[PDB]
Amino acid sequence: RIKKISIEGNIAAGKSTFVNILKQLSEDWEVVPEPVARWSNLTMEQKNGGNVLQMMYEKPERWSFTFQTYACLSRIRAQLASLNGKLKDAEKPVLFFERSVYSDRYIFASNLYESESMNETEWTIYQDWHDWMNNQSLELDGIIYLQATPETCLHRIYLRGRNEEQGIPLEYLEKLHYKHESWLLHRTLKTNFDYLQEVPILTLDVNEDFKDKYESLVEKVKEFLSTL
Amino acid sequence: RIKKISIEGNIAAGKSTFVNILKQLSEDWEVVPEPVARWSNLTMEQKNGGNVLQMMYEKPERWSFTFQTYACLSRIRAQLASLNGKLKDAEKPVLFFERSVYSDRYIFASNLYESESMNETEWTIYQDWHDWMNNQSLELDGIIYLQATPETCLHRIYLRGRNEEQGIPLEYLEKLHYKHESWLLHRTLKTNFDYLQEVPILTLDVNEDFKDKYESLVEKVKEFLSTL
Ligand SMILES: Cc1ccc(NC(=O)c2ccc(CN3CCN(C)CC3)cc2)cc1Nc1nc(-c2nccc(N)n2)cs1
Ligand SMILES: Cc1ccc(NC(=O)c2ccc(CN3CCN(C)CC3)cc2)cc1Nc1nc(-c2nccc(N)n2)cs1
Ligand SMILES: Cc1ccc(NC(=O)c2ccc(CN3CCN(C)CC3)cc2)cc1Nc1nc(-c2nccc(N)n2)cs1
Ligand SMILES: Cc1ccc(NC(=O)c2ccc(CN3CCN(C)CC3)cc2)cc1Nc1nc(-c2nccc(N)n2)cs1
Ligand SMILES: O=c1ccn([C@@H]2O[C@H](COP(=O)(O)OP(=O)(O)O)[C@@H](O)[C@H]2O)c(=O)[nH]1
Ligand SMILES: O=c1ccn([C@@H]2O[C@H](COP(=O)(O)OP(=O)(O)O)[C@@H](O)[C@H]2O)c(=O)[nH]1
Ligand code: NA
Ligand code: NA
């Protein structure tokens, strides 16, 4: 049975960097990058996603619903493709997701509703769609939360240097940070997925640069995986 | 095995009337009304759908994508519920769909793209979603096409007397009519569903009032069902 583990964290916490570290450490370890992340850098999904990203910069209250539905669809399709296609010869197969359908809804879509970028009907339609489109083989064995300060993530947005992201304000990162803490640390966020309240969570502090010094983080991962 | 038959036709051709006739004629015959039809007349789907219908009257180029995705989702959910819930004691089970996921895409969503109510990205995202969300137990054994003139349907819009529909112009009904003829009569419409080109189609002329005189139409249905 493939173990499914989500990597969760704020914008520029280090999730993509961490996932591309893990992928290389075992042939029994595979990764599903976040579609939105891949859109940001030829396929019709990439063409659609690049357009949606640009349209979102111009007016989020017009495109948030369209963006969030396509982002989540794209993720489910990509996660199921890896789950059905990969690790068939693995001894102890693990698939690492760069975020989940839960971060799609409870972090991003939720935040856009709160920022008045979706109206009540768009948010209620989104939740209905999400509740339904998520009815199975994608349920998580575990979550790894990469915890960074908003300041760390703001500095890492600067380092990554996507022109379109240099305008992201600290306040927005602080809001996303608070949502992550409520969901994954305090476990105060109510979701419509009962099993989630029971899913084991590994919290890793990634404030210190780990690109060349990640053995302690991977040790924590291997320990966490052995408990599942 | 439940036989799945779609009832296809223009606005106010008589599909709802015909489906509510059929339902009563056999305990082995069940119907899935079109969600959009039900929205037009307490549940969160009805609340969402009524809002989406009203928002669409005000500006279709804003709401067409949201409307078409929720309409099609709502249909898949309702068709699968009947397929999983009903006719378990039937000898020769038949489920009649009021329209299909194909009329959703090739008639309505297509028409809205053509009427510049969806941009290329919205239409390409819609088709991608549709291709994907349709990957199974809903494939049709047969189609029944209720063929009425645009003039007949315009007269039947008047008879049904939905205030919001009295503005529908003959030209729009003529466009929908042409799409139906290309798909179901000439079979000239290319779809992304190969099996559809092979699905048996029964064409019924419903220009004459059938509310109290429908035996000949039902005879054609029973004959058609015996060939499948
Ligand atoms: C690409 C892009 C472009 C622009 C914006 N912008 C805003 O988030 C935003 C919101 C609100 C506002 C203020 N108000 C003014 C007043 N208006 C009436 C209402 C908006 C200004 C700007 C975000 C992005 N990226 C995003 N990615 C995600 C996402 N990332 C991964 C997974 C996932 N599911 N979702 C979500 S959002
Ligand atoms: C530059 C700027 C300045 C202001 C605001 N505003 C709001 O986001 C916003 C928040 C909340 C509300 C309602 N609240 C507050 C006011 N009230 C006191 C209580 C209700 C109203 C408006 C957004 C921006 N731009 C932003 N860019 C992004 C972004 N850009 C690319 C990728 C990405 N993921 N995200 C996100 S935010
Ligand atoms: C409820 C409602 C309200 C309004 C409208 N309006 C328009 O169709 C419409 C379009 C185009 C125009 C002209 N232009 C001006 C210029 N603009 C730039 C761009 C629009 C004006 C009006 C349609 C509806 N109903 C509808 N139901 C369906 C449907 N029914 C069953 C299954 C299904 N999948 N889909 C589709 S559409
Ligand atoms: C009253 C009126 C008047 C005009 C138009 N216009 C167009 O629909 C339309 C068509 C096509 C195009 C591009 N074409 C043409 C122009 N060029 C010559 C070649 C490209 C541009 C615009 C729409 C309306 N209203 C309408 N109501 C509905 C409706 N209302 C409730 C439920 C429902 N299902 N449908 C449908 S249509
Ligand atoms: O320990 C780290 C983690 C990340 N980064 C840099 O910070 C930016 C954001 O990282 P990533 O793209 O992995 O963040 P994600 O958005 O995927 O969490 C990138 O330029 C990384 O190279 C770094 O220098 N050291
Ligand atoms: O043979 C018929 C078929 C329909 N109608 C009336 O025409 C309108 C449209 O019918 P329906 O709602 O069944 O059309 P649909 O949109 O479902 O095809 C309704 O007022 C029907 O009662 C009728 O008088 N005789
Ligand atoms: Na690997
Ligand atoms: Na019946």
The dihedral formed by the CA atoms of A106, A107, A113 and A116, expressed in degrees to the nearest 10: 170
Whether A115 is in the pocket of ligand 1, judged by its Cβ within 6 Å, is yes
How far, in Å, CA of A197 to CA of A187, rounded? 7
Give the minimum alpha-carbon distance from A125 to chain B in angstroms, rounded to a whole number: 7
Residues with CB under 6 A from ligand 3: B 36, 53, 56-57, 60-61, 68, 71, 104, 108, 115-117
Kind of pairing, strands B29-32 and A201-205?
unpaired
The shortest C-alpha distance from B77 to chain A (Å) reads 8
CA distance B152 to chain A (A): 35
Q: Is B165 in the pocket of ligand 4 (CB under 6 A)?
A: yes
The answer to whether B37 and B87 have CB atoms below 8 angstroms apart is no
Range of the domain at B45: 1-228
* A128, B72 contact by CB (below 8 A): no
* Chain A to chain B Cβ contacts (< 8 Å): 52
Burial of B29 (0-12, 13-18, 19+ CB in 10 A): buried
User: Which of these is catalytic: B30, B58, B61, B98?
Assistant: B98
Beta bridge partners of A29: A94
**Which of A11, A57, A172, A174 for mutating ligand 2's site (highest number of atoms within 8 Å of CB)?**
A172
Task: Say yes or no for a CB contact (<8 Å) between B48 and A124.
Answer: yes
Q: How far apart are CA A89 and CA A67, in angstroms?
A: 36
Q: Two tokens at A222?
A: 């291997």
Is any ligand 6 atom within 6 A of the Cβ of residue B14? yes
A122 and B47 within 8 Å at the Cβ level: the answer is no
Q: Binding site: residue ranges of B?
A: 9-17, 34, 57, 68, 99, 104, 156-160, 165, 208-210
Is any ligand 2 atom within 6 A of the Cβ of residue A171? no
Dist. CA B185 → ligand 4 center (Å): 24
Q: Give the span between the Cα atoms of B51 and B45, in whole angstroms.
A: 10
Bridge partners for A94 per DSSP: A3, A29
SS (H, E, C) chain A: CCEEEEEECCCCCCHHHHHHHHHCCCCCEEEECCHHHHHHCCCHHHHHHHHHHHHHHHCHHHHHHHHHHHHHHHHHHHHHHHHHHCCCCCCCCEEEEECCHHHHHHHHHHHHHHCCCCCHHHHHHHHHHHHHHCCCCCCCCEEEEEECCHHHHHHHHHHHCCHHHCCCCHHHHHHHHHHHHHHHHCCCCCCCCHHHHCCCEEEEECCCCCCCCCHHHHHHHHHHHHHC
B182 CB-side CA count, 13 A: 13
Per the structure block, which two tokens stand in for B152?
């007949």
Distances (CA, A) of B166 to B68, B154, B156, B159: 22, 9, 10, 10
Residue A92 Cα to ligand 7 middle (Å):
12
Minimum-distance CB partner of A73 among B52, B62, B129: B129
User: Looking at chain A, which residue has its C-alpha nearest residue B132?
Assistant: A77
Ligand 4 pocket member B161 (CB < 6 A): no
Cβ atoms of A217 and A210 within 8 Å: the answer is: yes
d(CA A123, CA B96): 32
Place of tokens 């539905």: A69
How many domains are contained in chain B? 1
Q: Quick one: closest CA in A to B76, which residue?
A: A132
Strand order in the sheet with B94-98: B29-32, B94-98, B3-8, B142-147, B201-205
User: Can you tell me which residue has the tokens 């370890």?
Assistant: A29
The technique by which this structure was obtained is X-ray
B50 SS3 class: helix
